[PDB]
Design a binder for these strands. Structure first.
Ligand SMILES: [Ca+2]
Ligand SMILES: [Ca+2]
Ligand SMILES: [Ca+2]
Length: 247
DNA sequence: GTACCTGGAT
DNA sequence: CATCCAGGTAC
């Protein structure tokens, strides 16, 4: 059923909403999420566990209309899959790395102008895997070795995503500073591996390969795999789970 | 360096 | 809609 901590969650979110505009705690796209976590007095972490007891929290700037990142997970196989993808199919960046950012769909192939390969997802319902298909520019499928088992994906959903509190927000730039304001929250439940994979097949949920580079700090110029992400179109949540207003 | 975390701008 | 991308850390 429902989390024992939903009331506490509502109070924690309400406290942030009541705070109005908040200056960013970290410059960059990530700031919206880092700023919210700081307000909840949550130290950043890299665990695939929920944020607030058993509840996952996600912030989302409504006007930006970006895909909602659900979770990341490296391929089940082969070993070193993302390194292989980068090395074989990436493009050269300013530092001499290969990079590979591709938002991949299950209903159509990419048509990349800046990369020399195209990509599609096959949901293999018989074998219960999510498979990446790589095509050359002559439309030949050259590599479908990379996959995620349904079991792996279900394990991430069970660990992290039973209850997803999505906090809708806005931003502004004022006096050369970036601010966020958190306005409302919905609870998204009943996402299953079966609904996830249906969404990938239909194009509403993407498999996002996100291999870039670091651009500042000690690691500047080094390869930065942000993790392959499973990302949902916010307009489509009701087709993949249930949604109710909580704040 | 890999694999997780947090997310857009155009 | 699609194309391409951003700042963090544990180990
Ligand atoms: Ca988290
Ligand atoms: Ca979160
Ligand atoms: Ca299929």
């Amino acid at each position: 059923s429902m989390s024992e901590y939903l009331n506490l969650l509502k109070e924690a979110i309400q406290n942030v909403v009541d705070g109005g505009w908040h200056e960013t705690k970290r410059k960059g796209n990530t700031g919206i999420g880092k700023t919210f976590e700081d307000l909840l007095e949550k130290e950043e972490d890299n665990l695939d566990a929920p944020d607030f007891h058993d509840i996952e929290i996600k912030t989302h700037e409504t006007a930006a209309k970006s895909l909602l990142t659900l979770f990341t997970k490296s391929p089940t196989n082969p070993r070193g899959a993302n390194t292989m993808l980068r090395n074989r199919y990436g493009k050269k960046d300013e530092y001499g790395n290969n990079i590979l950012h591709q938002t991949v769909s299950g209903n159509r192939k990419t048509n990349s102008n800046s990369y020399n390969y195209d990509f599609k997802i096959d949901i293999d319902w018989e074998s219960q895997v999510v498979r990446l298909e790589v095509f050359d520019k002559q439309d030949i499928m050259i590599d479908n070795s990379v996959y995620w088992s349904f079991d792996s994906l279900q394990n991430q959903l069970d660990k992290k995503l039973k209850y997803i509190a999505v906090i809708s927000a806005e931003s502004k730039i004022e006096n050369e500073k970036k601010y966020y304001k958190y306005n409302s929250a919905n609870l998204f439940t009943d996402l299953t591996v079966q609904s996830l994979c249906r969404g990938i097949e239909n194009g509403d949920i993407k498999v996002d390969i996100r291999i870039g580079a670091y651009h500042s700090g000690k690691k500047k110029g080094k390869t930065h795999d942000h993790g392959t992400a499973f990302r949902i179109n916010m307009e489509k949540l009701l087709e993949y789970g249930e949604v109710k207003v909580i704040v």
